[PDB]
Structure formats: C-alpha cells, structure tokens
Subunit: 256 residues, 4 copies
Amino acid sequence: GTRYAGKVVVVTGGGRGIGAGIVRAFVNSGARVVICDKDESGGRALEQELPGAVFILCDVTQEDDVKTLVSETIRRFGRLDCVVNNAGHHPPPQRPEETSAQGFRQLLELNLLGTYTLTKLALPYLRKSQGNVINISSLVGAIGQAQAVPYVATKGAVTAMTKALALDESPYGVRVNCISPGNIWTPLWEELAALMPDPRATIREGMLAQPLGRMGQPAEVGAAAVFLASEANFCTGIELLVTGGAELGYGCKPSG
Amino acid sequence: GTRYAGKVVVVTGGGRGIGAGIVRAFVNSGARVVICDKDESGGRALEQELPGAVFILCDVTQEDDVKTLVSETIRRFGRLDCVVNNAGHHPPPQRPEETSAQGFRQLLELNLLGTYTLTKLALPYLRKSQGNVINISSLVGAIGQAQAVPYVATKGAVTAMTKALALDESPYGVRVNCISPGNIWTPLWEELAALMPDPRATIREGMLAQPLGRMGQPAEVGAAAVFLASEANFCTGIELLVTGGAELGYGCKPSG
Amino acid sequence: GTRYAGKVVVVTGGGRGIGAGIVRAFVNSGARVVICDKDESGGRALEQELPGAVFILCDVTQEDDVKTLVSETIRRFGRLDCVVNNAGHHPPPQRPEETSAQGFRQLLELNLLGTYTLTKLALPYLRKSQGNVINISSLVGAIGQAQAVPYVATKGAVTAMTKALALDESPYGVRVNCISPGNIWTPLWEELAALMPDPRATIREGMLAQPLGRMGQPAEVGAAAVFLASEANFCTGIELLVTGGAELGYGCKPSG
Amino acid sequence: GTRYAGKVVVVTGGGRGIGAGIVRAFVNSGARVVICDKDESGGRALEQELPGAVFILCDVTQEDDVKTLVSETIRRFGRLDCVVNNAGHHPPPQRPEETSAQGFRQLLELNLLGTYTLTKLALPYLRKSQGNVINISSLVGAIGQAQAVPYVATKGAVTAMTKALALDESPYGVRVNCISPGNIWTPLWEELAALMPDPRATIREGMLAQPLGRMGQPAEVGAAAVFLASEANFCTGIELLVTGGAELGYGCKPSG
Ligand SMILES: NC(=O)c1ccc[n+]([C@@H]2O[C@H](COP(=O)([O-])OP(=O)(O)OC[C@H]3O[C@@H](n4cnc5c(N)ncnc54)[C@H](O)[C@@H]3O)[C@@H](O)[C@H]2O)c1
Ligand SMILES: NC(=O)c1ccc[n+]([C@@H]2O[C@H](COP(=O)([O-])OP(=O)(O)OC[C@H]3O[C@@H](n4cnc5c(N)ncnc54)[C@H](O)[C@@H]3O)[C@@H](O)[C@H]2O)c1
Ligand SMILES: NC(=O)c1ccc[n+]([C@@H]2O[C@H](COP(=O)([O-])OP(=O)(O)OC[C@H]3O[C@@H](n4cnc5c(N)ncnc54)[C@H](O)[C@@H]3O)[C@@H](O)[C@H]2O)c1
Ligand SMILES: NC(=O)c1ccc[n+]([C@@H]2O[C@H](COP(=O)([O-])OP(=O)(O)OC[C@H]3O[C@@H](n4cnc5c(N)ncnc54)[C@H](O)[C@@H]3O)[C@@H](O)[C@H]2O)c1
Ligand SMILES: Cc1cc(-c2cccc(C(=O)c3ccc(F)c(O)c3)n2)ccc1O
Ligand SMILES: Cc1cc(-c2cccc(C(=O)c3ccc(F)c(O)c3)n2)ccc1O
Ligand SMILES: Cc1cc(-c2cccc(C(=O)c3ccc(F)c(O)c3)n2)ccc1O
Ligand SMILES: Cc1cc(-c2cccc(C(=O)c3ccc(F)c(O)c3)n2)ccc1O
Ligand code: NA
Ligand code: NA
Ligand code: NA
Ligand code: NA
C-alpha cells in the first residue's frame, strides 16, 4: 500500500482484537507499525506474520514501559507519525453498588491515563512529523451503558480529552481524533459473553443492538483509523462513530 | 401561581395533548394563555375550563390566521412574552418509497414553516417584552426514527432553526429554546397506535422504549416549558430532552 | 486507483467547489462518476478533463431531470453504487425578519427535497448493488449560524433525514451517511465574501473560525466521501465532521 | 416556597459560588438543605443566614467524611431526596506538556470520584425516597477547552457517568441528571482571572464567549437544579446546558 507509506505508527493493545485489526490496516497502507501490548502471545506472532510490524512488550500503565516504547520506536525507525491508543479493558457487568472507588481508579489508570501518558511522551515527535493521535473510545461514552459506570466514565473522559488535546495541539499541526466503536466482535467480547448465564443469547442480543444486524469487525475499525491518519487532514477533535447505527432510533430499554 | 405572573403566552396546537398540558402549566404559573388551534372542540372547552385561558381559532399554516392570532393577542392582553410552537403532526409510519415530495412539503408546512411564521410575527413584540420562544421538536430529530423520513426531517429542521434564531435574537435579549419530547401519551399517540395491526402491543413497545418504563405526560412537557420561559434566563438555543432516557444505552434495533 | 474500482457514483452539484472535489476523489479511487449539475460550464470541462467522468445536465429541483439522471446512469454504466447529494446553496446573510416563507420553501426545495428526490429514485438500484448514500450537510445544522435561519434549518433536516433513512435502509444493506463540512474554500465562499463590506476581512474571520487556522479544501471533503463509500462498511447514519475543529471550545460570539 | 417542600437536599461545595446559589434555590423552594464543604468560612455563614440550611464540614475526597455526611443527614432529617454533586475545581490553564499524571489523578479524585462516592453512599436512601441525583459537569466536557486537558477529561467522565447511572437506577425510579454550565461568575472564575496577565481582559473575553454577552449567575444554575429535582419527572440521564449559548455558531478560535 501507499496511502501511509514511509510513516511510523504505534498501536497499543495491538496483539489481538481491534488493536490487531488496526495494526493490519496500517501495515496494508504501507506504514511501519510498532505493536505494543502487555501480553506477548498475540503481538509476537503478529510481528512474525507481518513484514513491517515489530512487537515491543509494554504495559501502558507503567510510565517507564511507555518511555521505553517511545525511545525504542525512534531509535529503530527514526520518526513517529501516529499513535493509536487502543489498549483498554471492559470489566464484567457490575451494578453501581458492586463497584469500588479503587476498581474505578484502576480502570481509569488503563483506559484514560495510559492513553494520556503515551500521548504526552509521543507529542514532541508527532510535532516534528506533523503526526496525529487516534484514541479508541466507545459509543457508550456518549450514550451510556447499563452495569458499567466505571467503564462508561473512562470513555467519556477519553472522548472529552481528545477534544481538549485537539485544541492544544492545533497550533502545531498535530491532529487529535477518536474512534467510538460500538459492538465489535473481539476476544474481549467473546470472554465477556462466556461469563453470562446464556452466552449465545448475549451474543445474539449484541448483534441485534445494531440496525445492520451484526457486530463490527476489527478490520473496519482499522480502516477508520487509517482514514484519520492518512486522509482526514481537516479533521481534528472529531468522534468517528463505528457502531452499525446502534445509537439510532428507539429500541427496547401508559404514562404512569 | 406566581412564577410567570403578569405574562402572556401563546400556545399553538393547545387544544389537546402536549399543547393542552403546556396551556395548563402556564395557567398554573399565573400567566394568561392564548390557546391557538385549528380545531375548536378541545380548545374551546379548555377556555371555558381555565380562568386566564382564551381560545383563538387559528391554522398555523395560514399566514393570515397567524397574523390575526398575534394582533388579537396584543389587542386583548397588551403584551406578548412567550410563544410555544407546539402544533405539529406525525403521519402514520411510511416506508421511504411510500413517501412523496408533496406530502413532505405539506408536513414541512405544518411542523416547520408554521413555527417559522408565528415566531417571525411575534418577535417584534417579544423583543419589547424580552420574551422568549419555545419550539416543540422531537427526540427523533436527533436520533432518527424508522418509517418517518419526512417527520424526522421536519424535527431536525426545527431543532437546528432554534439554534440559528437563538444566535440572531441574543443581541435583543430574546431567548429561543426547544423541547425534544420522546414518547408522550397523547391523543395522537393513541390514534397512531390504533392504526397498527396490534395496538396494545404497539403501546407496550412504546412504554418500554424508555428506561423509566412508561411514556411521558403532557404535564411533564408543560413543566419543562414553564421552566424555559420563567427560570432559564441563561439558556438560549438549548434542546431540552423530555424522553424518559430513551436515547440512553443499547436496545434491540457474528460480525458478518 | 483501486479502492472503489468497478463502482458507479453520481455526484450532484459536481461542477465546482466541494462537488468537483468529490468527483475527483472518486475518479482517483477507480470509480466511474456521473457529474450532475444545473450549470454546464464547470461540469462539462470536468468531463473532458477526467477519463471516467461524464457530465449530465440535471437540476435536482426538477423531478423529471432527476428521473432522467438515474435512468441515463443505469443505461450508460449498468449499475449504481453511490449517490452523493452535494448540490445546495447558501443564501447571503439575512436577518430573520428579512427572510420569507417562500424563500425558505425554495431553499428547502434545493437543499432538502432535491436530496430526497434523487435518493428515492436511486434506492432501488442501490439496494441491488448494496450501495450507499452520502449527503453533504453542514456543521451549522448542528451548532447553528447567525443570519441564516433558512439555511441552518435545511441542513438540520438533511442530517436528521440521513439518520431516518439509515434506519429504513439498514435491512437492505444500504448505508446512509452524511458529511458536515465547516468552512470550505469554494467558489460559493468567495462569492459570499465578495458581497460583504470587507471581503478580505470576512475571509480572514472565516479562516480563524477553525483551530487549524485555515479553511478546508474540496479534496478533503472528497477523501471523506470516498472513505464513507468504500471503507466504512459498519458506518450508517453517522455525521462525519470535516470542520477543522470549528465546533471545539470557546470563541468570541459580568453576570448582568 | 412549596415546589420542593418536605424534601431534604445535600449540596457539595455549597459554601460559595454555584454551590451556594444551588443551596439558596433549594431553600427558596421549601427544602431543607445540608451544605457540605471542605472549607468552613462560606458554608457556616450560610447556615446562619438561611433557616432550613445546615452546614456539615466534609471533604468529598475522604470517604469517611462522606460516610458521615450521609449518616448525619439521615440522623438529623430522617430522609434524603436529592444529592447535588457540585464540589469541583478548575486548575489554572496548563499546557498538555505542563500536566502530570499525578495531578490528573488528584483532579479526578475531586471532580469524578468524589461525585461517585457520595452518589454511591446516598443511593440506598434515594431509592427509598425515589429521589434523584444532579451532577454539576461543564460545557467543556462536551466541546473541549484549551489548556485544560485534565479538567475537560474529568467533566467528560462526569457527564458520561450520569448517563450510565441513569440507566442503572431507572428500574428503581431514581433519576440521574447533570447540568453543564458554561461561564458562571463565581469566586473561582475571579481567582483564575487574577492569575492572568490581564485579568480585566480575561473577564471581558469570558463575557463575550456567550451570545447573551454576559456570564451566568449561580442563581441560574440553582434554578436549573431545582427544576431537575422537583419538576423533571420524565428526565433522566440528560445534560442540561446552562451556557448562554456559548456552544452555538462560529467564533474566533485560505485553505492552506
Ligand atoms: N470490542 C468492542 O465491542 C469495543 C467497543 C467499543 C470500544 N472498544 C475499545 O476498543 C479497545 C480494544 O478492545 P478489544 O475488544 O479489542 O479488546 P481485547 O481484550 O480483545 O484486546 C485488547 C488488547 O489490549 C491489551 N492490553 C490490555 N491492557 C493493556 C495494558 N495495560 N498495556 C498494554 N496492552 C494492554 C490486551 O492484552 C489485548 O491484546 C479498548 O479500548 C475497548 O474499550 C471495544
Ligand atoms: N406525542 C409524542 O410522543 C410526541 C413526541 C415528540 C414530539 N411530539 C410533538 O409534540 C407536538 C404535539 O403532539 P401531540 O402528540 O400532543 O399531538 P396531538 O395530535 O395530540 O395534538 C396536536 C394539536 O395541534 C393541533 N394542530 C394540528 N395542526 C394544526 C394547525 N395547522 N394549526 C393549529 N393547530 C394545529 C391539533 O388540532 C391538536 O389539538 C407536535 O409538534 C409533535 O410532533 C409529540
Ligand atoms: N463551502 C462551505 O464552506 C460549505 C460548508 C458546509 C457545507 N457546504 C455544502 O456543500 C455543498 C456544496 O457547496 P459549495 O461551497 O461547493 O458550493 P458551490 O456554489 O461552490 O457549488 C455548488 C454546485 O452545485 C450546483 N447546483 C446548485 N444548485 C443546483 C441544482 N438545483 N441542481 C444541480 N446542481 C446545482 C452549482 O451549479 C455548483 O456547481 C452545499 O450543499 C453546501 O451547503 C458548504
Ligand atoms: N464557574 C464556572 O464558570 C463553571 C463552569 C462550568 C462548571 N463549573 C463547575 O461548577 C462547580 C462549582 O464551581 P464554582 O465556580 O462555583 O467554584 P468555586 O471555587 O467558587 O466553589 C467550589 C466550592 O466547592 C468547595 N470544594 C472544593 N473542593 C472540595 C472538596 N474536596 N470537598 C468539598 N467541597 C469542596 C470549595 O471549598 C468551594 O466552596 C465545579 O464542579 C466546577 O467545575 C463551573
Ligand atoms: C449486558 C452487558 C454487556 C456488556 C458487554 C458484553 C460483551 C462485550 C462488551 C464490551 O466490551 C463493549 C460493548 C460495547 C461497547 F461500546 C464497548 O465499549 C464495549 N460489553 C457490558 C455491559 C452490560 O450491561
Ligand atoms: C413503529 C412506529 C411508530 C411510530 C409512532 C407511533 C405512535 C406515536 C408516534 C409519535 O407520534 C411520536 C413518537 C415519538 C416521537 F419522538 C415523536 O416525535 C412522535 N409514533 C412512528 C414511527 C414508527 O415506525
Ligand atoms: C457572517 C456570515 C457569513 C456566512 C458565510 C460566508 C461565506 C460562506 C458561507 C458558507 O457558504 C458556509 C459557511 C459555513 C458553513 F458551515 C456552511 O454550511 C456554509 N457562509 C454565512 C452567514 C453569516 O452570518
Ligand atoms: C484561557 C483559559 C481560561 C480558563 C478559565 C478562566 C476562568 C474560569 C474558568 C473556569 O473555571 C471554567 C470556565 C468555563 C467552564 F465551562 C468551566 O467548567 C470552568 N476557566 C480555563 C482555561 C483556559 O485556557
Ligand atoms: Na514483522
Ligand atoms: Na378562560
Ligand atoms: Na471523461
Ligand atoms: Na440555618
């Protein structure tokens, strides 16, 4: 591919799921990709699979891991053009009274501060390349979700942070955007469904939450990411919905 | 009541449903209310019922009716403080290929231009009173609805128009806001449900579209309207959602 | 290009400005493009310029023009995959009291019903191709604009209509999305600025309304359109903002 | 007043600014109000001033303070109907590279987790009263702000959390809403302006960010809060904008 040839991209949580779909999309567009992940299994195999992708073990909640991620990226490839903050986690459904402040803080540490930390360490290099930041948020940050108060809050923060940072970095020509996926079929979706009383039914309800009648694919998030990086030069601070239309119209969720 | 004492309010489509609930709320707040409606039956009885409400027959799609509505309001009460553009219609569910351009134009004539015309004729008097405009839009203008392309489009236009007019009239201290109700139990809802194969089931689905598990009441829209008129002095161009939370979260509406 | 090879695209108002930028983007992606415009000058030259683009004279407010546009497209190219409803107009700045209902109706005829009519005539063919609709709306439909009540209202309607139609056509795999550009430097922008007391200053204010410090280009809208057509297969009913961040943060627009 | 007579309201950060305006509004509506604040000076004087208001020293970042706030409220007044999470802080303008993860965590501790903690401890009592939660967020959570990445992120989280909790508590008839104020003239605004090179100019720019040409007042936020508590019985999960129209239209913030 030539759409993003000669560019260098870091993707966190790139070892599986949406992150791996994003990794593949950027490789297909001609970019060199650093795969960052806290687990080795998926990311290491993906490095072997994809010419132009390399794997760096890095836990985004550990600032020294992230500092080394950036320095190794520059040392090995000489520039940095795009950072995709995809690493994140959705806890199992929890009622509000079943949540804790410390569990909330830990989820904020991954979903929000890890995104914050990599972005901050990368920005000096992005400014030199007039690169861009892509945060992976969630539709539920905008519309809410049941039994997920901490998760929804972290994603509301990421989407808002994307806009604030877009304002700050616009004078330097660094664009900052986010993608808000809806139901994307990933290993995380599969794992969460398996915890449920009826996994197959939970999966069917998840497919039917979209007017398109299916869940999305990691490759479709990946294509949205490559668009924001390579072709959306007048887009900054936007929230790109990749949701199959889940937010549209009425659904199941006289005046007394 | 004293919240809006000494003020004069015009409510279109005030003879039944949401409009009548709005009429009652303003009367309860101490205002004098002109009830405008194209049908006499509901509005005339409401005038007899409510001290401080009077009924003026007026079809908002007829500019001469609307001109007389405003002039009679000033002649009889000496001022005009608030205009509530509530008159509107929801056609029966229609597939896109079952719609027509001329049916679309007629619906725009009622839901949009009738609101436009009364607002324009009222604004010279609202400027003198530092009054305000309240348009009744719909949640489906913001999130869409199935089998209602013309209706949804008219309400998208009303909500947008509310913001444009708010900008234009802010130098004169005239506020312009809208209410976007979701499912409100009114004679219109009842009539539309009766057209359906299973009316009782359509009504149950309508109640369940809200997390609160019920439809809203005209009185609840009325309270929102009295708030915008009497107490929201720093609110202009807002869309006040009165929807029971229908827009929140996933509902019924693997990656292949 | 190969991103949209073998596909057939109709672009209305394709003779200049954003429409011509969209035409060029689809030609660059390998598509055959029918340029529709009410004026011959730009579109005819563009047909001569671009192999794979042809010009069909068509006023989208004339249903017989639009019927012939679709039938000629099928007759000459054998399929139809994407319709881009770009034709539209922004009147000069007008205060609300300077507007008329009939001027409002005429603007609705172009900006809204022309989009409605082509979409309706095209949908049987889009369903056969699992094609898609792209409406060009405006950021001011979502946030309002001063001295543009009719224009803002037409664009609020287009954005809302996009969501309603997305719901209706999702069972058939036809996606329906819109692009909301902000300030894009086009012949229309230039013409409107020339009417102003100080054109150069109006143009400078227009550049500064964006955090990126410039207006957008038609080519950038074109790239967004090609993305929605060719790569956003899980996107339907979305509003893709192409605005340079104009909607972000505070600007120029103690408590007494 | 009688609008909220016999009800018991807790307002955090109630000692000055928006919180004190909210306290006064609920007292004026007939409610008994517990003023919570980490500083004694404002809240203690307000207790002496207002019959029906009492002051409880409580730092919302200290879970034992908050536990005692709730238990003392029940012990002294026998019920709890409304919690207004107003306590929060806006740091001085900081460039992204001038922020720290630990400063971010501390701001999240106040603006987000303090709101989370009081809400969680209050909900068993709100469920018994079918009471409601009102979170004070900010417009900049939705539209972003320059030099305020941590602040904007905390408010994006609060707004999103409001919707998630609304979903969770709707089965119990507990409504959860938020107010997003724009520029409100408070001691915090005054203090931040005084740090600036030109305070008077910063204040003038702040007034002009609104189409209404002024900042808002705490009393106007207070009226919005009393509406959500006492009269918005079909509103849950909404974001009530109290911004003077700052989010509307273009402002200061050719295609190259
Ligand atoms: N799957 C969906 O439906 C969905 C929807 C909306 C948003 N999202 C978001 O998309 C992102 C990816 O989700 P997914 O479904 O692909 O998840 P996933 O669990 O399948 O994969 C996430 C990857 O990130 C890695 N990761 C987790 N914590 C990490 C850390 N501390 N440091 C580095 N890597 C770490 C994991 O090891 C894994 O490889 C998340 O931010 C999630 O919130 C997912
Ligand atoms: N009912 C809902 O669930 C719902 C939801 C969202 C928005 N709305 C909007 O609320 C408004 C009122 O709806 P409703 O359900 O109360 O409807 P309704 O049919 O019960 O009452 C509407 C009233 O307006 C009058 N009216 C209609 N056309 C008129 C005209 N040309 N001139 C003057 N009066 C006219 C009718 O005679 C009637 O009295 C409409 O704008 C509607 O789109 C309704
Ligand atoms: N320029 C901007 O800043 C801007 C911003 C947001 C949205 N938009 C929208 O983008 C679209 C294009 O705007 P532009 O600035 O390129 O305008 P433009 O005036 O430069 O070009 C519009 C083209 O459409 C054609 N057209 C007009 N009426 C037509 C009709 N009845 N039938 C067929 N063709 C017709 C014109 O002849 C012209 O070739 C419009 O819908 C406009 O509202 C523009
Ligand atoms: N002023 C504005 O323009 C503005 C705009 C939007 C949102 N807001 C929000 O409104 C709220 C109030 O802002 P304000 O301008 O009135 O601020 P303020 O500084 O004038 O008053 C805030 C009050 O909260 C108290 N407080 C702070 N930390 C506390 C803690 N840990 N525990 C208990 N009380 C604590 C302070 O002592 C003070 O009395 C905040 O959440 C703020 O983010 C303000
Ligand atoms: C019944 C319920 C289900 C989930 C759930 C189940 C599987 C996967 C996910 C998930 O990872 C997800 C799904 C949609 C999103 F927009 C998103 O950001 C993440 N969630 C969560 C909460 C629930 O109350
Ligand atoms: C199955 C279906 C139902 C309706 C329907 C049925 C009864 C009443 C209404 C209605 O008057 C309404 C309902 C909600 C709104 F936000 C609104 O502005 C109006 N609508 C419409 C379309 C449908 O595809
Ligand atoms: C001072 C003022 C200016 C304009 C104006 C001037 C030049 C071009 C345009 C325009 O065509 C446009 C600009 C932005 C949009 F989002 C859009 O859909 C169209 N508008 C309009 C109104 C005004 O009160
Ligand atoms: C030049 C600049 C100014 C501020 C600033 C100055 C005074 C007060 C505030 C404030 O407390 C505030 C203002 C608006 C809000 F919507 C809000 O939630 C809080 N802010 C902040 C950042 C800046 O880059
Ligand atoms: Na490799
Ligand atoms: Na009477
Ligand atoms: Na050609
Ligand atoms: Na007292």
